[PDB]
């Protein structure tokens, strides 16, 4: 339909870190929540690529903070997995579902636990992350952490479980 090309230009600009182009395209009515071939919205791609300024612009111009792509990822899943703490916090401040499950039952806490970033685990726990969530294999974040040598996280997750 009309505007589809603006949405594709916006998706590219958010993926590529083109701050000014994003602003131009929004001022021209581009669909902030258009999605690409795998269901990524601009907010997904900005969070995936670590583009904090664009994440912020997209949120203020109406991005769906809890949009899901074809794998069930939300922007928060991608920001956690790729170690963008400020984006994780901004996303949560704007209503990101901290316990969002992708199509395999993986939550952001699972991801932070597996990757091994203690501060990400603490942030998510502080915002109500579910220590008891089980993915499609019955694994909790604890299971992922301990299975990946992230002992300090496993212990923090254990104490939270009590």
């Amino acid at each position: 339909g009309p505007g589809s090309d603006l949405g594709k230009k916006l998706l590219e600009a958010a993926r590529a870190g083109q701050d000014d182009e994003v602003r131009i395209l929004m001022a021209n009515g581009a669909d902030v929540n258009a999605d690409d071939n795998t269901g990524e919205t601009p907010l997904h791609l900005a969070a995936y690529e670590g583009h904090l300024e664009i994440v912020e612009v997209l949120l203020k111009t109406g991005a769906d903070v809890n949009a899901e792509d074809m794998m069930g990822f939300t922007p928060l899943h991608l920001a956690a997995a790729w170690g963008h703490l400020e984006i994780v916090e901004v996303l949560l401040k704007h209503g990101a579902d901290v316990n969002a499950q992708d199509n395999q039952g993986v939550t952001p806490l699972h991801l932070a636990a597996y990757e091994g970033h203690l501060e990400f685990v603490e942030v998510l726990l502080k915002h109500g992350a579910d220590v008891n969530a089980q993915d499609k294999f019955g694994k909790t974040p604890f299971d992922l952490a301990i299975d990946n040598g992230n002992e300090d996280i496993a212990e923090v997750l254990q104490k939270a479980a009590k």
Binding site: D36, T38, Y48, A81, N103
Partner: peptide, 15 residues
């Protein structure tokens, strides 16, 4: 397995 999640990459993706 391995590989971080991404647009076309599930968390559980084969070996």
């Amino acid at each position: 397995k391995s590989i971080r999640i991404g647009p076309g990459q599930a968390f559980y993706a084969x070996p």
